[PDB]
Ligand binder design. Sequence first.
Ligand SMILES: *[C@@H]1O[C@H](CO)[C@@H](O[C@@H]2O[C@H](CO)[C@@H](O[C@@H]3O[C@H](CO)[C@@H](O)[C@H](O[C@H]4O[C@H](CO)[C@@H](O)[C@H](O)[C@@H]4O)[C@@H]3O)[C@H](O)[C@H]2NC(C)=O)[C@H](O)[C@H]1NC(C)=O
Ligand SMILES: *[C@@H]1O[C@H](CO)[C@@H](O[C@@H]2O[C@H](CO)[C@@H](O)[C@H](O)[C@H]2NC(C)=O)[C@H](O)[C@H]1NC(C)=O
Ligand SMILES: [Cu+2]
Ligand SMILES: [Cu+2]
Ligand SMILES: [Cu+2]
Ligand SMILES: [Cu+2]
Length: 534
Amino acid sequence: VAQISPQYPMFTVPLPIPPVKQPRLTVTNPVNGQEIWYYEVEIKPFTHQVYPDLGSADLVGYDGMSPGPTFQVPRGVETVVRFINNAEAPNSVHLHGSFSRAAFDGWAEDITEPGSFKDYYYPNRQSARTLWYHDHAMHITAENAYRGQAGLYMLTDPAEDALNLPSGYGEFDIPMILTSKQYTANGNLVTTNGELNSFWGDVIHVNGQPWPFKNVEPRKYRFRFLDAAVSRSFGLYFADTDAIDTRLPFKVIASDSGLLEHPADTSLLYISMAERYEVVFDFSDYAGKTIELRNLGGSIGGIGTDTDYDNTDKVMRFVVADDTTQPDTSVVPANLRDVPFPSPTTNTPRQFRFGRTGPTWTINGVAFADVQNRLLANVPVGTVERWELINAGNTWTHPIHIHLVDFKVISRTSGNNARTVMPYESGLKDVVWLGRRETVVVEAHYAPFPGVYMFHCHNLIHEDHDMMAAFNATVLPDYGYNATVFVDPMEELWQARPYELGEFQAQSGQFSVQAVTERIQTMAEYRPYAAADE
Ligand SMILES: *[C@@H]1O[C@H](CO)[C@@H](O[C@@H]2O[C@H](CO)[C@@H](O[C@@H]3O[C@H](CO)[C@@H](O)[C@H](O[C@H]4O[C@H](CO)[C@@H](O)[C@H](O)[C@@H]4O)[C@@H]3O)[C@H](O)[C@H]2NC(C)=O)[C@H](O)[C@H]1NC(C)=O
Ligand SMILES: *[C@@H]1O[C@H](CO)[C@@H](O[C@@H]2O[C@H](CO)[C@@H](O)[C@H](O)[C@H]2NC(C)=O)[C@H](O)[C@H]1NC(C)=O
Ligand SMILES: [Cu+2]
Ligand SMILES: [Cu+2]
Ligand SMILES: [Cu+2]
Ligand SMILES: [Cu+2]
């Protein structure tokens, strides 16, 4: 249907690459003698001229940019990130794809008010994967993500580096953060505030830029796709501009949780909110061509309900040179890794229905605001469970996400007989798309940390109103590991703390080297991640 946002100069601005975030300090962990990387991120308002010939857009971002800066962290290095709110609304940071302790996971009520900060302690022990960090503040997650609070966090492993996949952040390893927004006639953002169904957006962005282009060489590139949109799901394909309907083959190498067992030969990639898929595209057969990255219409080929607009079939263009300046020394091995699947279980799947209760998006008829009723599952730590995720609706779709865990997709049924499990769903994931009338069974090891964790739809409008609940990964009282201080996301020890802006700007007082060092060493003594050792 007709674009609402102003006409945009399509494919004229280069694809921006978010800069890599550098830690301020390293602190010796007195428990293990290892260095903890300490980072400071300032959440603040800024403006950005998205439309060349109109006014600016008002944004609020990590370090006053959108997307947020990219973290690049090796497995085995613990990090602490001081997320400092210097904005106008509260925040809660979640590292999506990290088995963080409950009080470092971005529990929706575990907020930082403007003029406060929270220290988040991350383990960085899981399989190499594309994580992302984004806002999770109760009721305002959609608008906080939409106005710019999302960034990438790449967990690296030299074992993955030895596969010789296309490499170098911003060279042949390219972040592809997809959003879908709407703009006013003067080039400001249309707010998601007041939307209670879905905010589709009519302007497609990659790394914060509407409809960009990139100059590429005729060789293989790693693309790290993330759907960071509020409500738009995508069916991605690549096409020569000389045959814009003919899909070109590519390989999917990784899902949310890390590498597939084998690359999946693909010409169409379904990706819904919060899904990461890493793709290798080989431009070598397309020297001197223009390859358009496009998006399936028809509400993602009858799987979704998303509105299509005039230009939401277009994502970006790749202008391919006639030859490479350096040899392509990259490869996509037929065997990528042994995926660490959980044990199969014979236990009766739990059932969760994602539907509506009057006007509210609910799980089993419950809204996250309803403290009394929102704790829908108690699961002993170390248990494997199958969850049957049911979308009985034909007029909504729900990408479902479970915190803490990686899961295997066991089965999909479609009441429209549309599809089953996709080949790129063969590995481990943490989001799965319930298309129209879809039921998906996932199987997950509820390990290794006890605590209260969220699961929800990652359509942020649904999530905000109010399609989110909690599970408690439980332990017996003789279980050690300081569990009494790490099970409760609201534990006073880990709460946000007020700061003076001068202190921050001068790196004095509680931002002195002494104060940060004492704080992180005290945190480290509690040994939050010890139960994941080996
Ligand atoms: C999510 O799961 C966690 C467990 O993984 C759970 O935390 C547990 O809460 C229980 C119950 O509150 C705690 O056990 C209590 O400990 C205190 C202090 O030592 C005791 O006073 C309590 O004794 C009561 O129960 C006794 C019966 O055995 C009675 O004799 C007595 O009258 C008391 O009423 C009780 O044992 C336990 O320490 C925690 N466990 C951990 C590891 O923190 C948490 O509550 C769950 N979250 C939610 C929201 O459900
Ligand atoms: C649980 O957390 C406590 C508190 O940080 C840890 O105890 C500290 O350990 C070091 C080394 O023995 C001492 O120097 C500190 O004084 C301790 N503080 C207190 C008051 O005990 C404890 O080691 C942690 N336990 C586990 C199992 O991780
Ligand atoms: Cu998320
Ligand atoms: Cu998450
Ligand atoms: Cu939903
Ligand atoms: Cu979440």
